[PDB]
Design a binder for this molecule. Structure first.
Ligand SMILES: NC(=O)c1cccc(NC(=O)/C=C/C(=O)O)c1
Length: 183
């Protein structure tokens, strides 16, 4: 299972396109979008769905999935397209992977670092946030001290008004779209 992938450009025409643009535009309408691409990685996608199938049947009425933003340098884009956000990724709440509710956070040059042509990249990612608590600065805390292998799926900065989520597990996030844009 080598998780090869294709990149398909999203046509302005595509219903999909407008949904990503709108959500991006809530907090980043001052940036100019060059393009939006869909990342098609069947092995990565299947393994993502496997964890979701598990997580749904486990968390009852909880909506496990959210769509969050993650900014990264150009160099990491191939890495992320193949391996999502699993383990071997160089790009005070955790040692997992951070994801932003609002594009503007991710659009910081420190995450969405401009390349030579001045182009910034932010993914719009399906993340399985599941059941979360407030996090502190490598594995999530345990839900129940009397049953402590049962863990929070993610942690967040504020539980009832969250602006970021941290994932620590494998196949917990799928990089469905990439948004390329400039200042
Ligand atoms: N990659 C992002 O878009 C993003 C979004 C929200 C938060 C962060 N990262 C952090 O706040 C801290 C990352 C780290 O300490 O490695 C990145």
């Amino acid at each position: 299972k080598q998780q090869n992938f294709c990149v398909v450009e999203l046509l302005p025409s595509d219903p999909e396109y407008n949904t990503v643009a709108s959500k991006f535009n809530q907090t980043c309408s001052h940036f100019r979008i060059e393009k939006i691409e869909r990342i098609q990685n069947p092995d990565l996608w299947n393994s993502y769905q496997a964890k979701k199938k598990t997580m749904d049947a486990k968390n009852g009425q909880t909506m496990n999935e959210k769509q969050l933003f993650h900014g990264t340098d150009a160099g990491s884009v191939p890495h992320v397209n193949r391996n999502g956000f699993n383990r071997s990724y160089a790009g005070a709440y955790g040692k997992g992977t951070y994801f932003a509710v609002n594009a503007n956070y991710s659009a910081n040059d420190t995450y969405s670092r401009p390349d030579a042509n001045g182009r910034k990249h932010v993914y719009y990612v399906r993340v399985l946030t599941g059941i979360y608590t407030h996090g502190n600065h490598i594995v999530p805390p345990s839900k129940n001290p009397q049953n402590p292998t049962d863990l929070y799926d993610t942690v967040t900065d504020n539980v009832h008004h969250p602006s970021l989520f941290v994932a620590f597990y494998d196949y917990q996030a799928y990089p469905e779209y990439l948004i390329t844009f400039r200042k």
